[PDB]
Design a protein around this ligand. Structure first.
Ligand SMILES: NC(=O)c1sccc1-c1ccccc1
Ligand SMILES: [Zn+2]
Ligand SMILES: [Zn+2]
Ligand SMILES: [Zn+2]
Ligand SMILES: [Zn+2]
Lengths: 286, 131
């Protein structure tokens, strides 16, 4: 029994040395014996590797005292409809030095905003995990043709996450004390959140009594939507997967049952707009 | 495509600590709420006649210890997140780490909570002969 979470996507034909392998599974077969691992005199550590680690397969199903749930019920989501922001991500595939994982490329929101990121991944090295630009290409097919010019229009993730916080803050400061990301098939959206979301116990803003919705790695401080200028991370967001409500087919067919004013213009923000619109019609119309 | 590094019993704790502001505190709080320690570590077969020093080039467990691969006992290596060092490099990856047998059920938790004496090279409160 294995998981896809933290799958090693490198093309290296062997496993790792016992001192460098993050897990028993990743240690090379040559060191395995009698149920455990052995150090072999004369067999050295690898000092120049770059192994892309997949961030697909997160499971936010923990129950830890004082830490809120990220995924909320339909009833809780309905009470916080003013915090609803549809979210969708179009990915690009790892290529050349790695294969087997999706990297965020176009991040779309129900506000009409699309942000383009440089293809970036988590690369294990002999010393640390290097969060860096990796070789990538858009998926093949006429439906993903629009993603080709985006491969050279991306911004570094340190700039993208600041822009996400600024956009959420401007949109939500006079609407809600939180954000509820409205998702359709959450897997890849939760993987993208790893790039711009931090979690922890419920905190209060550094300048007021409101709950913290943002975090800054510059000062290790917390802020609400009113005081988050310059902040780089979304702190303790909430989210819901609309697909889990009983729908069978794709997003567009389900959205089209209630709405005709949102024609699919084939872009991440349109999928995010359709997702929020479908959830609003399902919960508040007729 | 690719090769799996992890087992499903670790998915929840690694996901929790991969997103936390403070990963070390998240791991400690996860255990305090009834969660299982991180498993699938690199445990070594050795002669248990080693020096007993905390961090070494080869396995050096004495009779009170177990030897483990360094990266496998590091929460930051396990979650693929930033190391709290100034230069962001790891002191465990590329080395073997000796853990008291009484703490060998949770080697990641042990390295998080414990300190190596810089003078004798042993864990404080688990072998240090300085004071
Ligand atoms: N025996 C092994 O560990 C082998 S053989 C070729 C690849 C691997 C590997 C690499 C990373 C993670 C898990 C497995
Ligand atoms: Zn505030
Ligand atoms: Zn619509
Ligand atoms: Zn480490
Ligand atoms: Zn000492």
């Amino acid at each position: 029994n294995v998981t896809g979470l933290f799958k090693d996507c490198s093309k290296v034909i062997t496993g790792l040395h016992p001192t460098q392998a993050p897990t028993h599974l990743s240690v090379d077969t040559k060191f395995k014996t009698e149920g455990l691992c052995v150090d072999i005199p004369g067999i050295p550590k690898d000092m120049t590797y770059r192994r892309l680690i997949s961030m697909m397969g997160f499971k936010m199903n923990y129950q830890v005292n004082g830490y809120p749930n990220m995924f909320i019920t339909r009833e809780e989501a309905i009470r916080h409809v003013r915090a609803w922001i549809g979210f969708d991500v179009e990915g690009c595939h790892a290529t050349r030095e790695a294969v087997g994982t999706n990297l965020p490329l176009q991040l779309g929101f129900s506000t009409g905003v699309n942000l383009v990121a440089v293809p970036t991944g988590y690369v294990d090295t002999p010393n640390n995990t290097d969060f860096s630009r990796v070789s990538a290409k858009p998926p093949p097919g006429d439906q993903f043709k629009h993603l080709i010019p985006l491969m050279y229009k991306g911004l570094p993730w340190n700039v993208v996450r600041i822009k996400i916080v600024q956009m959420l803050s401007d949109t939500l400061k006079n609407l809600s004390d939180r954000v509820v990301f409205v998702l359709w098939a959450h897997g890849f959206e939760l993987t993208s959140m790893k790039y711009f979301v931090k979690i922890g116990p419920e905190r209060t803003c550094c300048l007021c009594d409101r709950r913290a919705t943002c975090f800054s790695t510059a000062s290790d401080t917390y802020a609400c939507w009113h005081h988050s200028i310059g902040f780089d991370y979304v702190y303790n967001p909430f989210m819901i997967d609309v697909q889990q409500w009983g729908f069978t087919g794709n997003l567009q067919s389900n959205h089209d049952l209630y709405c005709q004013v949102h024609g699919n213009a084939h872009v991440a923000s349109c999928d995010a707009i359709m997702t929020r619109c479908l959830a609003v019609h399902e919960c508040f119309v007729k | 495509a690719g090769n799996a590094t992890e087992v499903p019993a670790n998915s929840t704790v690694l996901s929790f600590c991969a997103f936390a502001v403070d990963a070390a505190k998240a791991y400690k709080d996860y255990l305090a709420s009834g969660g299982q320690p991180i498993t699938n570590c690199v445990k070594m077969l050795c002669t248990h006649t080693g020096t007993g020093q905390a961090i070494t080039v080869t396995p050096e467990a004495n009779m009170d210890q177990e030897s483990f691969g360094g990266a496998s006992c590091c929460l930051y290596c396990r979650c693929h997140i930033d190391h709290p060092n100034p230069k962001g490099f790891c002191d465990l990856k590329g080395k073997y780490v000796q853990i008291p047998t009484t703490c060998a059920n949770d080697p990641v938790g042990f390295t998080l909570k414990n300190t190596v004496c810089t003078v004798c090279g042993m864990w404080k409160g688990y072998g240090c002969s300085c004071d």
